[PDB]
Design a protein around this nucleic acid. Structure first.
Ligand SMILES: *C[C@@](*)(O)[C@H](CCCNC(N)=[NH2+])NC(=O)[C@@H]1CCCN1C(=O)[C@H](N)Cc1ccccc1
Ligand SMILES: *[C@@H]1O[C@H](CO)[C@@H](O)[C@H](O)[C@H]1NC(C)=O
Ligand SMILES: [K+]
Ligand code: NA
Lengths: 259, 29
DNA sequence: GGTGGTGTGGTTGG
């Protein structure tokens, strides 16, 4: 997260860290959507151009965290994966269309002050909240700036970062890039003419873009950190998987495989 | 419980986090 | 230290 700030304790209790078993490293963000299901970006698990193709046994999920690197002894919970479900029409060859995956935990997780699920939007919520100029909130342990390279240490935060960003009009998203955008995506971030800054960055993928409903006071996950070109560049905007658009797939996986 | 999206340390304690007001204000301005 | 840097802890034991 670029130009964000340190999260408060318990601010994003649905935030999940996807962690590689060996070597021991941050892989991506993710979100907790029940006691047994985590949502993330598909490219965190499957990206053949970078030689990435993780199986269940290669990864863990760490839930309830604040510190990036420390094991938060009596606070975080570590879960293993039963199964990964990648969207069958995830397009890693071209534009990361449908950049979405579900991960079923081997056992349910007990909730706490630090560990709690986000809501997923229904049609009405999505039509109401996913409008240009409304702001949502992105969280992650990714890079603090676009990184020029190749090493990284000072570029990584000590604790989870948060930034609030406005949803951008589709024609603006489209004209900002030559990568083909789809209805399975939306973009967010400030225009150069707005002054304020901020974006997700590498290592933030899979993390949630959430919005707080002014009708019921709940947080809803509207997007998944997916892609961008650089980070926090003027005239560029972060791209997010559009959760509601993919919600029938989400529901089909959980209904058929879930617990 | 059906308590998705309500944070134990914030909504459940009637406590606001430091920047959520920004989000709410964006639905106006 | 333990898959940081300081605590009569901390978002947690000793
Ligand atoms: C895996 C995620 O951590 C990362 C998130 C980047 C978000 N960036 C901004 N500014 N909000 N995603 C990526 O790194 C993805 C995975 C494949 C490459 N990629 C990109 O974002 C490229 N920079 C652009 C791109 C290349 C190919 C297909 C789609 C986009
Ligand atoms: C990802 O790698 C796994 C590991 O065997 C394999 O089963 C799966 O088909 C792979 N997909 C691609 C495109 O490599
Ligand atoms: K300690
Ligand atoms: Na920008």
């Amino acid at each position: 997260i670029v130009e964000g700030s340190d999260a408060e304790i318990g601010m994003s209790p649905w935030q999940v860290m996807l962690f590689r078993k060996s070597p021991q490293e941050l892989l991506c963000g993710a979100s907790l959507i029940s006691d047994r299901w985590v949502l993330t970006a598909a490219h965190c698990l499957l990206y053949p151009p970078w030689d990435k193709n993780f199986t269940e046994n290669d990864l863990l999920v760490r839930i309830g965290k604040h510190s990036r690197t420390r094991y938060e002894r009596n606070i975080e919970k570590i879960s293993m994966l039963e199964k990964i479900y990648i969207h069958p029409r995830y397009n890693w060859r071209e534009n990361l269309d449908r950049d979405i995956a579900l991960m079923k935990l081997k056992k349910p997780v007990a909730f706490s002050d630090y560990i709690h699920p986000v809501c997923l939007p229904d049609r009405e919520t999505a039509a109401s909240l996913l409008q240009a100029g409304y702001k949502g909130r992105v969280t992650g342990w990714g890079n603090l700036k676009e990184t020029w390279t190749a090493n990284v240490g000072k570029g990584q935060p000590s604790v989870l970062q948060v930034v609030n960003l406005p949803i951008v009009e589709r024609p603006v998203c489209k004209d900002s890039t030559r990568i083909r955008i789809t209805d399975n995506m939306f973009c967010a971030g400030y225009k150069p003419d707005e002054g304020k800054r901020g974006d997700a960055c590498e290592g933030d993928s899979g993390g949630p873009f959430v919005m707080k409903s002014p009708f019921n006071n709940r947080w809803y996950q509207m997007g998944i950190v997916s892609w961008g070109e650089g980070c926090d560049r003027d005239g560029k905007y972060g791209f997010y998987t559009h959760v509601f658009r993919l919600k029938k797939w989400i529901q089909k996986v959980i209904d058929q495989f879930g617990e | 419980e059906a308590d998705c999206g309500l944070r134990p340390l914030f909504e459940k304690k009637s406590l606001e986090d430091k920047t959520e007001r920004e989000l709410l204000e964006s639905y106006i301005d």
